[PDB]
Design a binder for this molecule. Structure first.
Ligand code: NI
Ligand code: NI
Ligand code: NI
Ligand code: NI
Ligand SMILES: [O-]
Ligand SMILES: [O-]
Lengths: 100, 570, 122, 570, 100, 100
């Protein structure tokens, strides 16, 4: 596979997102790291899908809403950042105030 | 020109009279005073103040009142106060708390807090800064426990062990000169301050004392090695000669005596009573009465902190498993029921709140959680506010009195107990720069940056491959203070005066900073900051009811805690 | 033929502990209001003061129970126990500081026990 | 009072006549003798025996017959016996095997096994304790291989390499003085004992000898560097002068000679024949005939161990890939068919069982598995019991003879071969305290705790954040013996006598314990414990059939092994 | 996310459980580490769900039965322990003899 | 669980395969590490299922085809190797030219 350090680390994010998605599916209000993981993995998968940075900045604000998460979680998350390989190489995505 | 307070606090952190919520608790701390000069706040970045000829002085060499490091705009939470200041560090020590910058052009600059060519900057605006936690009940069982401790703001581990040997799994003991030497050498690779306890057991002085001379920083008396009157007596005689502290986990079984017999053997000498409530060990059922005595420095361990609805079920089973006890053997069941008591655990919450139990600790990996001393301190304070109300001593709706009482339990008081408060345990000038930055939303839960000897040792930081350090995954990671030979300069190995005089560090090739243990034998409960109460604690032998001043101490267990499921992935 | 990994197949028979040593049965009472549990290898005369028994009969002896086990006395409980003889050099040091030498010095042990209030010196 | 044997074994581990199943194999070991005094068993914990004035002596200083460490109630499995004893360790060495405790009050205490103030305790009741495995065929290719080895109970790595360079990927060789020096320095950070082999190739003495003087512990002759008569001869002449061992991977291609030519070049001198069966390399097809000779110390490597239904398919393809061979080139196919032979692999199982092949080894990362030497030894013994029956030498239904024959293959025999059995390779008084504790259910599969120089170096242990060390995830982890400078005192770098005399450790700044290689040149097959058989082994050049004493040696491959899918996640 | 050391480690348990569950679903009798992973993840997810320690001590004995696992596995597992964050903080759960 | 170093590492492969399979399922042509992960996990799961080394050498050549992967990926992968515990212990599987 020739995994580099970032590729190894970022597998964890996908895994944490999978965990959080299962928790959501069984009806739990998500907590801070769960919410962050879901949105982060969404960004990384979107890059893999070939979306633009601008598309992901928009979409990232609609992945989870305040009724999906515990009290105070929306206000704990000021922004979520992820770097991923787009068709045009690595780029940084910042999603500002992802959960209203 | 004037700035509204919301905007001021957003830019520079809070100022006098402003309050901040601790994590998701109901606890609020209020800024008591502020060392700044409004308009001359220090800050760093593009177009900011700390630039050459401006807030940074371009004239002075490092020796000439210039800092190695300035933490700008810190909200300090300490036994000494809750207040706003810049913190200046030099040669790994806190040298100034006040106002940093450039006397060329700024008013009110503390004279030895010049930002110069030599000065690094950490922005602490909007952070709470505390001393590093001092955990005095550490079992050295698994080296992975160190990062666990750092991640919750602990910077000093006092205890014992040689790894997952049964003696170490049960007791905070590194026994004998050889094991002590081996563990002093191991310590060279642990990125945290360390002091090692010898076995406080023997009927002759020499076998116990030779551990002190070998480099131990104290002793542990534990019932698993025989917490007999003889072992208690000899250990205290050694300690009084050597100027080191003795910790005790007393005879739960009451085999050679009851509490009064252990107290008689102690004979008025200073001693640190571990897990004083007794679920963690000690004379059944009344060990917690130790915490009323003037010569006892009393600590709790953390799994009983605070009293919750799962506590008893969890502890009863934990005890049964750990002691290989059988549910169908009545002596085993009777033992467990005599040791795990809702009456004393509930009272323990209240005794903390009243300043009768002076210290917190972990009991890491031997009936306690290495990364939850700080966490559970604040959960306890929060529970007590909810159940007992703001303390009478409070003012202006703040929880400052409670916050100082509780922060003292894991910072300054363990340091004083151990004889190491000249070096660590508080944010004061002249002490080692072991500092923990917290985002208020994560306060007491997950440290932002842990500074050890003036260099960052541990941080919550993101992708190392990214353009900037904040992208995911943000996780706790060892920083440059832990790498190469810098681990030697950023950490202290605390040792007895005699081992230092006898040249043990040179003999063993220890390169870490060497700290001297001292002034442990002429202290008492009165010296425990904000937690100095002595009183007659009565524990009913029939009902286990705890009374202080004729009043039963009881409270309810809670179903939910703050600093819990909002934060943790598991 | 079902395989339990790492299982024992113990031999026939039984293990006699403390074989060939004198055994002595005595009555012991916990006169205190808190429980006392006594390990297999504590010099029996040096146990908690509030246990009432013929202290002389505890000298040079310990409980005749499997190594590492203990006898439990609830508050107010009186029961019989069986003692066996200490072996090796038959010296005891430390514990309650009643012996600190040969267990043969019964007169000295009892004097110290009585002075310090260990119940049952007769 | 009497205790039934089931209850006795549950409390103290098994005693005389009791049997224990090794993992999920059909192999049973029986306790041959027991050093205890019934009723005075040592144990540690609350209300237990090893307490001051009781089973722990409170009088004696460390120097006065007191131990640094007591392993209580160990079931020892060793070439010297299968028996029950306490094991006492001091200054990193095994100093007593017998009965520990306190002579004050206990009968039968071994005089230098006093449990005192200085003594740590490991509870070995219900564990099997063996010597650390000695792997003499290690390619140093990937530092991650060390934990792999420790996790399966290996404590000494002998071999060569500089990392994933092609020379090292093929051969256990660290070539020349400079690479040797570099790898001696690297070794300072490896938490395992190490000895380094130089390149056993040259036609002049000086280029070979200078490797010995530089710090090599032995030599490797490998066909990839030219396993010619000259290289064989010069290497053995060096070895005879230097008192180090020579390992050989002979000329598979028969390019410069057949087996008889290699034997003529050896000329009766002592040599260690690697992967003697020959799938791992050597004169095609008859290299295994080496194992009949009195001057040959023969080892197997592990992937042929034991003969299974996937072995041939796996090995044929592995060979083709590794040698970049093409399925459509008849010379390549002929080579592979000449080298990978069910006839010799099947016979290899039986030759082990008969004590004709004396040693096991890995061939780690160059045609062998770093963490499966111990594993595959026991799978082989189990297969042989199933196929050949209990050996004639057995008694009382136990597999003790087979167990001693097989444990010797990876403990004492490689140590003797290498000239290091004065330090390691068995549980005997006076040897280094490299000890492996196993739960019987995991025996030979996953070590519980690996002790190196008397301190735990590696353990299967759980959550470092938990109240106790057993909660999940339980995984193999480095312990305090590997941390800081303690890694120096808990491990041995084995070196030639000349390099030690010439001060190489001081020159290079080596801080590890330095072990001397010696007594390698006047040993032979007769010195291989329980595996000392010499005989005429005939390998038919046409059919590859192996004969010993006129009898064809053959057995069937098996479809399933114990110590496999019940245990492993992948 | 601010993952601490325990959170990172415990992701592995969830992953091993997911692996083991897939193996079970395709009809395999589970082995020792597979069984341990499934029961351990069950406990941790139960804590996240807000069950009590007592509920999990009971439920943990009914997650896998002897016909779900290989010969000898029930007898290899004396107990399974996990710590997880309950609504009232971290607690230890021990499931005794989980597979009869 | 008593995870050894290899067991811990190899969990990653399963995880990377799960990630890659999700990417395939949403219609993406797979890249080099994705393809390698899928085939590798297939081999390891096949060993767990009790298949032979020979069966897996055959099957491994039919897990992904050239239309499942990006241009050049078939030619980048000369062979894929994995060791796994078969019923008869650890064995090496090499799948040669897995994607035609
Ligand atoms: Ni304790
Ligand atoms: Ni403790
Ligand atoms: Ni070879
Ligand atoms: Ni090799
Ligand atoms: O403790
Ligand atoms: O080899």
């Amino acid at each position: 596979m020739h995994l580099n350090p970032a590729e190894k680390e970022k597998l964890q994010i996908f895994l944490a997102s999978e965990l959080a998605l299962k928790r959501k599916a069984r009806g739990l209000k998500l907590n801070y790291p769960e919410a962050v993981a879901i949105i982060t993995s969404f960004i990384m998968e979107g890059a893999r899908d070939g979306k633009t940075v601008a598309m992901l900045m928009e979409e990232g604000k609609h992945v989870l809403t305040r009724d999906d998460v515990m009290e105070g979680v929306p206000e704990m998350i000021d922004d979520i950042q992820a770097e991923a390989t787009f068709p045009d190489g690595t780029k940084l995505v910042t999603v500002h105030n992802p959960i209203s | 020109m004037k700035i509204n307070r919301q905007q001021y606090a957003e830019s520079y952190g809070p100022t006098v009279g402003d309050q901040v919520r601790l994590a998701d608790t109901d606890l609020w701390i209020e800024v008591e005073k502020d060392y700044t000069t409004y308009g001359d706040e220090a800050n760093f970045g593009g177009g900011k103040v700390l630039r050459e000829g401006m807030g940074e002085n371009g004239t002075y060499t490092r020796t000439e009142n210039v800092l190695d490091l300035l933490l700008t705009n810190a909200l300090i939470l300490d036994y000494t106060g809750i207040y706003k200041a810049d913190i200046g560090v030099k040669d790994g020590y806190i040298v100034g708390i006040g106002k940093g910058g450039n006397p060329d052009i700024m008013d009110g600059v503390t004279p030895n807090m010049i930002v110069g060519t030599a000065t690094e900057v950490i922005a602490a605006e909007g952070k709470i800064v505390t001393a590093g936690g001092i955990d005095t009940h550490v079992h050295f069982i698994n080296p992975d426990q160190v990062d666990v401790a750092l991640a919750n703001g602990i910077t000093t581990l006092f205890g014992g062990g040689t790894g997952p040997a049964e003696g170490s799994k049960a007791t905070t003991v590194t026994p004998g000169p050889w094991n002590i030497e081996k563990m002093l050498k191991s310590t060279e690779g642990l990125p945290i301050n360390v002091g090692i306890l010898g076995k406080g057991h023997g009927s002759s002085i020499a076998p116990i004392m030779e551990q002190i001379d070998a480099g131990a920083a104290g002793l542990k008396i534990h019932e698993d090695w025989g917490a007999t009157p003889a072992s208690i007596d000899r250990s205290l005689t050694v300690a009084d000669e050597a100027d080191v502290q003795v910790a005790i986990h007393s005879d739960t079984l009451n085999e050679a005596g009851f509490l009064e017999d252990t107290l008689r053997a102690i004979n008025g000498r200073v001693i640190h009573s571990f897990h004083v409530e007794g679920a963690g060990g000690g004379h059944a059922p009344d060990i917690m009465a130790m915490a009323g005595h003037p010569n006892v420095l009393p600590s709790s361990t953390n799994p009983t902190r605070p009293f919750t609805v799962n506590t008893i079920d969890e502890h009863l089973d934990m005890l049964m498993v750990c002691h290989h006890l059988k549910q169908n053997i009545p002596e085993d069941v009777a033992f467990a029921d005599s040791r795990i008591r809702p009456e004393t655990i509930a009272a323990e919450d209240i005794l903390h709140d009243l300043g009768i139990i002076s210290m917190m600790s972990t009991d890491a990996l031997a009936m306690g959680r290495a990364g939850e001393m700080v966490l559970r301190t604040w959960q306890t304070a929060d529970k007590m506010k909810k159940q007992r109300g703001p303390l009478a001593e409070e003012k202006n709706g703040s929880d400052n009195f409670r916050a100082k009482r509780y922060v003292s339990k894991y910072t300054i008081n363990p340091a004083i107990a151990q004889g190491i408060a000249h070096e660590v345990g508080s944010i004061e000038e002249g002490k080692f720069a072991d500092l923990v930055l917290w985002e208020p939303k994560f306060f007491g839960v997950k440290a932002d940056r842990v500074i050890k000897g003036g260099i960052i040792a541990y941080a919550q930081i993101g992708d190392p491959s990214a353009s900037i350090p904040t992208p995911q995954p943000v996780m706790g990671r060892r920083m440059y203070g832990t790498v190469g030979d810098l681990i030697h300069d950023t950490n202290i190995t605390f040792m007895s005066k005699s081992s230092i005089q006898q040249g043990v560090p040179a003999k063993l090739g220890l390169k870490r900073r060497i700290g001297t243990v001292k002034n442990c034998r002429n202290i008492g409960k009165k010296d425990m900051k904000w937690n100095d109460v002595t009183t007659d604690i009565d524990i009913n032998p029939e009902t286990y009811e705890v009374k202080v001043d004729g009043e039963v101490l009881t409270c309810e267990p809670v179903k939910e805690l703050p600093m819990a499921q909002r934060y943790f992935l598991f | 033929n079902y395989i339990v990994p790492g299982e024992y197949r113990v031999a026939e028979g039984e293990i006699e502990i403390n074989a060939g040593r004198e055994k002595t049965t005595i009555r012991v009472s916990n006169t205190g209001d808190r429980p006392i549990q006594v390990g297999s290898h504590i010099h029996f005369v040096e146990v908690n003061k509030e246990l009432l028994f013929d202290r002389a009969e505890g000298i040079g002896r310990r409980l005749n129970i499997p190594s590492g086990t203990a006898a439990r006395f609830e508050p107010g409980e009186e029961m019989e126990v069986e003692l066996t003889e200490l072996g090796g050099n038959r010296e005891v040091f430390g514990i309650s500081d009643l012996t600190n030498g040969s267990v043969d010095n019964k007169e000295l042990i009892l004097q110290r026990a009585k002075e310090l209030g260990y119940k049952g010196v007769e």
